[PDB]
Amino acid sequence: VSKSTQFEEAWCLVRSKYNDDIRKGIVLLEELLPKGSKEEQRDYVFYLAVGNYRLKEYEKALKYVRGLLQTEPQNNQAKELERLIDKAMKKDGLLEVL
Amino acid sequence: SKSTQFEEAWCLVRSKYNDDIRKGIVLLEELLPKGSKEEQRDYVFYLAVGNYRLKEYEKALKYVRGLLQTEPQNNQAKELERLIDKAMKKDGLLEVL
């Protein structure tokens, strides 16, 4: 039932090797998001970006991390994650058309 | 701006067209992190409404139940929950709204 239980569970799933676990972790984070404080929602949003990045949902991950940067332009984790997204995207495009 | 995106999402989620409702859902979900608390109230309610109308019952239920956690006496939310519960039992024509 608990909110910490869901977030701790989702933290593990988003860190997981298996894509099914990452998807479920995102599903938990999406449900937690409307229930969080403004600061928790910032954390939730960063972890939603990470999860979608690992699932190769690069456009969704980029949308989450761009939103974080609208309001926190000095956030270095978000800048770094955006850099990583850009780089995976460029390599994935190459793979598509080879 | 936030107000005009919500004004567009408000129209979309109430539209007669399924395409519109989908896009309204997209827009409310982006607004969700950006809103004050008395703003997220409306965002969460209209996400539940939109998902309900597209027969995304599990999503709609998650949204309204969270709203009922914060506002146990909210009779519009409770009514929308009653509607979701009923649509989940058998595929049919969703009630007027």
Author numbering:
A (entry chain B): 30 to 127
B (entry chain A): 31 to 127
The study reports:
A tetratricopeptide repeat (TPR) motif containing mitochondrial outer membrane protein, mitochondrial fission protein 1 (Fis1), mediates mitochondrial fission by recruiting large cytosolic GTPase, Drp1, to the mitochondrial outer membrane. The cytosolic domain of Fis1 is composed of 6 tight α-helices with two anti-parallel TPR motifs forming a concave hydrophobic surface. Fis1 interaction with Drp1 occurs during cellular stress, but not under physiological conditions, suggesting that cellular signals during stress activate Fis1. Human Fis1 protein contains a single cysteine, Cys41, in the entire protein.
To explore this possibility further, we crystallized and determined the X-ray structures of the WT and three phosphorylation mimic-mutants of Fis1: Thr34Asp Fis1, Thr34Glu Fis1 and Tyr38Glu Fis1. Each of these mutants was previously shown to be sufficient to increase Drp1 recruitment to mitochondria and subsequent mitochondrial fission in cell-based studies. In one of the instances, Tyr38Glu Fis1 mutant was crystallized in an intermediate state, where the α1-helix was still intact, but was shifted away from the rest of the protein, as compared to the WT. We crystallized the phosphorylation-mimic mutants, Thr34Asp, Thr34Glu and Tyr38Glu Fis1, and we observed that in all the cases, these mutants crystallized as covalent dimers mediated by Cys41 disulfide bridge between two Fis1 protomers. Upon closer examination of the crystal structures, we observed that the concave hydrophobic surface in the covalent dimers of all the phosphorylation-mimic mutants was exposed. Here we showed that Cys41 is also oxidizable and mediates Fis1 covalent dimerization through disulfide linkage.
